[PDB]
Structure 1
Amino acid sequence: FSSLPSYAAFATAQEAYEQAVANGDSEVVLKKLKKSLNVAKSEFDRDAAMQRKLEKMADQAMTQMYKQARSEDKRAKVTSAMQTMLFTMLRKLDNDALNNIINNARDGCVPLNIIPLTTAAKLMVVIPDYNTYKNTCDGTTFTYASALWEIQQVVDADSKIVQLSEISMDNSPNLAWPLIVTALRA
């Protein structure tokens, strides 16, 4: 608290007192130099008091104001923050089965139900084209989630059953493309 007029007044009072002490003038004369000095801080220790309270008061209000802003906007972007955090954790996990499925989902292949873990239950996987069929389906076997699934059914989009060997490179542009492959776990 240096940039206040009372600081200048206190400095003048202290200079006068220092001169009186170094001079040793009288006993009432220097008393007048402290009858008007300790009061000069009585209006200096106070006008530097409520403003000193105010600086930290503005601080300890504006800080919770920031905290309110962060609280109110943090809960407004949860739907994206959680999913980004999920995918970062997924990619950090580094598991072959999950990576295979996430790549299949990103390009062409998503299932139609929960993938079962028993060696008896059924799975339906959509294949959008023949390129993904090349990578995934090789004959009667279907590789998916680091597992083998025997093919027993594949149907085009308009619900017409199509046999296995019918599909190849050049006769492929003759079927409804979002194919649904039914398979059973090995």
Structure 2
Amino acid sequence: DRDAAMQRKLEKMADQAMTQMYKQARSEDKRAKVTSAMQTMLFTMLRKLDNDALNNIINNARDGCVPLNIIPLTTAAKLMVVIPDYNTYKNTCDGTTFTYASALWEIQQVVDADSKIVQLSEISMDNSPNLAWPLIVTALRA
């Protein structure tokens, strides 16, 4: 019984050590991977929502058609968005109208990285390959 008592004391201390080491290892592993885990969780939750505006802005961000400021909610407010190629312009921009964030915007001002004003008539398959891409389009919420 004395031998069994010291056996149980030894195995109790073994369980103490196992639990403490597991807690330490898991805590340091979770605190180490806090940025990438949070970003992956955020994009998982974003995909699960499957909102049409969120999916639109994310798909445009993958192509590089990201905004330059916070997308505004008030009507007739200003959105600045960089378009990096004619492909992203052809789908989003129809005439003077700009489809973005599941909303329609009125194109106001197109500039280049030289800040040169470019008319909407100059964006085409032939003249743009000489332009200073990426364009930056400033539009108003309609």
TM-score of the superposition, structure 2-length normalised? 0.97
- Distance in 2 (CA, whole Å) between partners of 1:180 and 1:160 is 10
- Distance in 2 (CA, whole Å) between partners of 1:168 and 1:95 is 32
1:59 matched to 2:7: no
- Distance in 2 (CA, whole Å) between partners of 1:168 and 1:138 is 12
User: Equivalences for 1:124-163 in 2 at 5 Å?
Assistant: 124-163=80-119
Aligned residue-pair number? 142
Cα deviation, residue 108, structure 1? 2.2
**What SS is found at the alignment partner of 2:107?**
strand
What stretches of structure 1 move > 3 A for 4+ residues in a row? Answer: none
TM-score of the superposition, structure 1-length normalised? 0.74
Give structure 1 stretches of 5+ with no counterpart.
Answer: 1-44
Cα deviation, residue 61, structure 1? 1.9
- Distance in 1 (CA, whole Å) between partners of 2:32 and 2:64 is 32
Cα deviation, residue 75, structure 1? 0.6
- Give the share of equivalent positions with the same residue, in percent: 100
Matching residue of 2:61:
105
Cα deviation, residue 71, structure 1? 0.7
Give structure 2 stretches of 5+ with no counterpart.
Answer: none
Cα deviation, residue 56, structure 1? 2.2
- Distance in 2 (CA, whole Å) between partners of 1:64 and 1:86 is 31
Cα deviation, residue 83, structure 1? 0.5
RMSD: 0.8
User: Equivalences for 1:17-166 in 2 at 5 Å?
Assistant: 45-166=1-122
